[PDB]
């Protein structure tokens, strides 16, 4: 409801009262240089959906708006131990493997990928026109997850993976009150767990958060670009907290005659296939007793320290 009010889609229950606050604020920030049109000028980049993320102020305006959203969230009751527990299921560990790199290490670097612009070059003589773009890239990796099931049956679950800075700006370990908002969704996928141990393998390139690299740079698809999955990191190494949670698929599923199972496409799918709040389990306040991610966890969750190394080489597209 609140999202429809703030954006001010036609799904707003009352535009005359709550306004069109997001879109108009964009327009305000884009027209400081000519607010009455006396200079017959158009809008800066903030006024255009195609370009607004270019401008630093974009992140400051959206940060403003997020505080309204958070003011609602924090009214909601903290998830309880029971709501967060999956009785029977214990994730004993998680690690990441990148080829050509120590365990629990992610690597980033620069890649150049060509795009043809010939179709965009009006009134220019015909033929291929290859633009060479520089952009961030990460080495492919996988997650290996150990999961003990004690319940003697088969158990279904949504695996929810996020990653966050370990430390704050001054290099002190982050407390949950802050870290929950810094948690970046890295993947979400259904799984069938057999009794006893389970070793689970998941490739970086299967993430349901992203679309193929090929969608961004030469049929369907959309989500976050694959080359931006991983944060840049640092040349010397940048510590992050990798987190995973197996939640009960029975309580998560959505009855949708025609429906990965965690995959969502807004064009095709009639319902969002996860019954948990987008951002679960980080979208609410911590129950009494938790001050940090170590205290937060139930056994069906697990944490891992990950070093995110940036390598400052540039590399052609393969």
């Amino acid at each position: 409801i609140l999202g429809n009010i703030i954006e001010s889609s036609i799904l707003s229950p009352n535009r005359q009262l709550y306004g069109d606050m997001h879109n108009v604020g964009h327009v305000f920030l884009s027209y400081t240089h000519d607010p009455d049109h006396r200079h017959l000028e158009s809008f800066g980049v903030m006024g255009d959906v195609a370009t607004a993320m270019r401008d630093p102020v974009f992140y400051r305006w959206h940060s403003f708006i997020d505080d309204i959203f958070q003011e609602h969230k924090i009214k909601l009751p903290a998830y309880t131990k029971s709501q967060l527990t999956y009785e029977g299921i214990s994730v004993t560990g998680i690690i990441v493997q990148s080829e050509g790199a120590p365990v629990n290490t992610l690597h980033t670097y620069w890649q150049q990928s060509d795009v043809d612009l010939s179709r965009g070059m009006d009134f220019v003589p015909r033929g291929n026109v290859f633009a060479r773009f520089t952009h961030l890239q990460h080495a492919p990796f996988q997650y290996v997850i150990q999961i003990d099931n004690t319940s003697d049956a088969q158990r279904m679950g949504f695996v929810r993976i996020f990653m966050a800075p370990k430390n704050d700006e001054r290099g002190q370990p982050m407390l949950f009150r802050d870290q929950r908002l810094f948690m970046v969704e890295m993947d979400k996928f259904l799984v069938a767990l057999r009794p006893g141990a389970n070793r689970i393998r998941r490739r970086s390139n299967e993430s349901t958060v992203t679309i193929p690299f090929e969608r961004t740079f030469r049929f369907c698809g959309c989500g976050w670009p694959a080359h931006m999955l991983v944060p840049k990191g640092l040349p010397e190494g940048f510590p992050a907290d990798l987190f995973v949670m197996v939640s009960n698929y029975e309580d998560d599923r959505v009855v949708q005659d025609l429906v990965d199972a965690a995959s969502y496409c807004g064009v095709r799918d009639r319902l969002y296939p996860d019954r948990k709040a987008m951002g679960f389990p980080f979208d609410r306040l911590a129950r009494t007793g938790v001050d940090r991610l170590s205290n937060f966890v139930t056994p069906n969750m697990a944490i891992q320290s990950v070093n995110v190394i940036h390598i400052d080489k540039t590399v052609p597209r393969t």
Binding site: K81, R287, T288, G289, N295
Partner: protein, 340 residues
């Protein structure tokens, strides 16, 4: 004997230095027995009190055992028979008092120590010694209520007493009524068991048990017949008696703590002030959650998991029907000795 009677003076006015009058007596404390604060003015200060008493009690300076460990606890700290460090510290002091050759060397040692050791600790250790030594049987010890009312009494009455005792002459002072049902109002259904939970006799009983069956100490004072079964049965009868009271107060049988990780619904604020620590006791809010422990001074480093793990190991032994000693042999939990 007079010697026996004199040890009981060590209980009178715990924080008043030992050179001050105790009853009709004074201790003639040796110079080297005074604490650092008082020694430099010692001769001036000892006389002021020393011309009041009927009796005078000589104390011989002798070589004493090493009291560094018993002295490691601060004088204005609280004493906990549950905290391992403190049990070790108490164990040591009981050792020392137990091992004095005779009652004269006990007097001398205790007189040195008293003004250097945490009063609650001193009182615990000495009492345990006096109950178990051969030469100090009989010896009617004073109740710990008369010695430390601050562990039994609403804090509000101490200034009431102080005023009464300062303003009013001895023949004319009227008794102070101790508040009851004072730790919570009607909104806490639990307040109703004030007559049990906060009874002087019930609480005195708990203390007494711990004096007779201490968990750490010389073997002499620890090893008692079926003391493990008594631990069980004593704590058991409390529950049963407690439930009995709950049924007479329109309440349910007490629920166990299901889970160490769920909030604990029953807050409690004691309204006690420790004159010894010169600090009030902390209370616990409604719906608090147990937290992992890291207290360097106390020497407790313990996750909730450590506790949960012990619980699982014990349940496993009870279900196996035996426990495993450090040598690795099995001790069967048979029907005589299992409970013990």
């Amino acid at each position: 004997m007079n010697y026996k009677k004199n040890l009981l003076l060590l209980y009178d006015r715990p924080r008043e230095p030992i050179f001050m009058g105790k009853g009709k007596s004074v201790f003639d404390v040796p110079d080297n027995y005074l604490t650092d604060r008082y020694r430099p003015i010692g001769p001036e200060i000892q006389n002021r009190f020393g011309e009041l008493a009927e009796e005078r009690i000589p104390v011989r300076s002798i070589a004493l055992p090493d009291l560094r460990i018993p002295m490691s606890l601060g004088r204005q700290e609280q004493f906990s028979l549950f905290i391992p460090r403190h049990r070790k510290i108490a164990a040591r002091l009981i050792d020392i008092f137990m091992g004095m050759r005779n009652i004269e060397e006990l007097q001398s040692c205790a007189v040195f120590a008293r003004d250097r050791i945490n009063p609650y600790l001193f009182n615990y250790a000495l009492s345990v010694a006096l109950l178990h030594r051969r030469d100090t049987k009989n010896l009617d010890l004073p109740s710990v209520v008369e010695v430390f009312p601050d562990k039994y009494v609403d804090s509000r009455v101490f200034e009431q007493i102080r005023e009464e005792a300062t303003v009013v002459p001895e023949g004319m002072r009227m008794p102070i009524v101790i508040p009851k049902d004072f730790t919570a109002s009607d909104l806490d259904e639990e307040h109703r068991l004030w007559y049990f939970r906060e009874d002087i006799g019930v609480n005195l009983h708990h203390w007494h048990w711990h004096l007779v069956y201490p968990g750490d100490g010389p073997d002499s004072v620890v090893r008692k017949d079926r003391r493990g079964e008594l631990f069980y049965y004593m704590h058991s009868q409390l529950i049963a008696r407690y439930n009995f009271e709950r049924f007479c107060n329109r309440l349910q049988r007490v629920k166990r703590l299901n889970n160490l990780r769920e909030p604990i619904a029953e807050g409690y604020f004691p309204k006690l002030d420790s004159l010894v620590a010169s600090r009030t006791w902390p209370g616990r809010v409604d719906n608090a959650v147990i937290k992992d422990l890291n207290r360097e001074l106390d020497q407790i480093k313990q996750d909730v998991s450590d506790l949960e793990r012990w619980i699982d190991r014990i349940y496993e032994a009870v279900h196996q029907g035996y426990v495993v000693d450090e040598s690795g042999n099995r001790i069967f939990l048979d029907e005589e000795k299992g409970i013990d």
